């Protein structure tokens, strides 16, 4: 698995758009990004955490 679990625990308040509305998972996935449904009303595909550039 590419993303850990820790790299996508990223604060609803904090998150990153990484797709656009009606994004899937598997286009999610796709871009290296995280992806939850759980919490409506903020970035359901957002960037993770890793190291930096
Ligand atoms: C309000 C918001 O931040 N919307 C996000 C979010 O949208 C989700 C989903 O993709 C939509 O189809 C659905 O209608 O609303 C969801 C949120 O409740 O996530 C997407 C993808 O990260 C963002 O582009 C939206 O801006």
Known sequence: VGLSANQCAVPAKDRVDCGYP???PKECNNR??????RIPGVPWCFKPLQEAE
Do not use: E, L, P
Not at 32 to 37: I, M, R, T
């Open 32 to 37: 290296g990004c995280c992806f939850d449904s």
């Open 22 to 24: 009606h994004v899937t």
